[PDB]
Symmetry: C2
Subunit: 291 residues, 2 copies
């Protein structure tokens, strides 16, 4: 069995739960299934990466290219106005999510374009990531390691830059065979320099659309009917709209920003909310009782 | 330029090269391609695993099951006996690959089907391999390491047993995202019990078939025209078939059994031959230069 009142990880004040007797139950079924039935669907930025360190703000994959020694100060500035002006649409309390889709496209298409202009080549991505300031949440070792141990499919579904994400986890030594990454990848040129991006622009709001185009990968994992979903946004809540068959599913969500803003929303959608947190020990603990 | 006279690895008493100048340009072809244009295609048993150790010839994927503690000495007799027969044909200098062909299937059908009679639980393959005496060739943590850090694709094409192979490399901690395994994967029932095998059998003489039956993978790598191929038999020379276009390709073959009998057969078909050897330094040294 399982009890959250007895799990030291669920006693910190940065762990809110609306339906506690809901969590324990879902976790119990996750045990009955163990590894054989386990599946994990995860976002990357601010979920598997840190939102903040030593009090300082940590970078997203896109940022690693925004603060690299290849982009100009006028790009960062021009990119900054982009966020300043578009974040406001993202966090618009009245307009509904659908009435934003076109925006994200412009936001990205406009933020990537500045990188497509800076002439950034694959060659420097390994070098650049080699010294950036990114950080995987505390316990990134127990997480990826227990999963690879029990062959638990991990589907990282990110609206960031795939090539950067793949270089980060590779350097952290966790990019194992069980990890599948689906993100916005670069469509480089002849000199190994960036020239564009592949396919549809995956962004914070179309996860519903991105997930469905992968039913492919999902029907193949029929026996992995139990899934834990790690996300940091409402949009990440759709990251699993394409799983073949579902017996149990836990929605763990990080609320790293606008804290005194969306707490009730998170308690409703996600089963578990992690308010201002930089560790995976909680999910690593649920995996302990499960694997 | 490339000169094998100076690369120490090419000076060991386990390196027999028919024509080194041809071997030196090919390697030189690999070097002019770089990472972005390289991919690996290798057999597993006796290639990435050892032929013998401490004195006793190391086990193959199947051997790990054969001798498992879940297989009765009776199950082993029927299995071991089922080997003392077809092998006599498997290495019958009389017959040809065309004839020996239908024989193999029978052997594999008889071997697996027997293992199927023992009711092997997927959940226990970990302990089984965890105590077996399997040996990965010398210099592998690095082999898999240089390749994973460079993002190089590795296609392990094995006529052994899928799941067992995955566990051996997983425990050695080298089963990275860049490693793609294609083998004879077993299937389980309700309580995870070995019932049958997925897809079309892969045996020691028809890798050309499987090589074709993997378009998505290679089509996605139609750009990696430089290839290093590693095998332990003539049949492994076909492993690079599903390969769309090839600029440069280096084939390296290990000879661990019947040395005096087959030595000349391997020299006339493998650019670089590694006679009775348990290390990969000749290939790791090529990677050190190439990447």
């Amino acid at each position: 069995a399982v009890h959250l009142k007895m799990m030291p990880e669920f006693q910190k004040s940065s762990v809110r739960i609306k339906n506690p007797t809901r969590v324990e139950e879902i976790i119990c079924g996750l045990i009955k299934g163990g590894a054989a039935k386990l599946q994990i669907i995860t976002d990357f930025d601010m979920t598997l990466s840190r939102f903040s360190y030593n009090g300082k703000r940590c970078p997203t994959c896109h940022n690693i290219i925004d603060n690299c020694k290849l982009v100009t100060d006028e790009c960062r500035r021009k990119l900054l106005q982009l966020k300043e002006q578009y974040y406001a649409i993202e966090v618009d309390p009245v307009l509904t999510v659908e009435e934003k889709f076109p925006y994200m496209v412009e936001w990205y298409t406009k933020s990537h374009g500045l990188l497509i202009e800076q002439g950034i080549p694959k060659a420097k991505l390994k070098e650049i990531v080699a010294d950036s300031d990114v950080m995987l949440k505390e316990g990134y070792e127990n997480f990826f390691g227990k999963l690879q141990q029990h062959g638990i499919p991990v589907f990282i579904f990110s609206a960031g830059i795939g090539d950067v994400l793949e270089e980060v986890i590779r350097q952290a030594g966790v990019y194992h065979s069980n990890v599948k990454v689906v993100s916005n990848f670069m469509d480089f040129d002849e000199n190994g320099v960036l020239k564009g991006f592949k396919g549809e622009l995956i962004h914070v709001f179309n996860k519903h659309d991105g997930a469905l185009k992968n039913t492919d990968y999902f029907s193949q994992l029929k026996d992995n009917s139990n899934i834990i979903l790690l996300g940091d946004s409402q949009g990440d809540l759709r990251m699993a709209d394409g799983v073949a068959n579902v017996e149990h599913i836990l929605k763990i969500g990080y609320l790293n920003d606008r804290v005194d803003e969306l707490l009730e929303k998170y308690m409703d959608s996600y089963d578990i909310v992690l308010v201002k947190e930089e560790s995976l020990e909680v999910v690593n603990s649920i995996l302990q009782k499960t694997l």
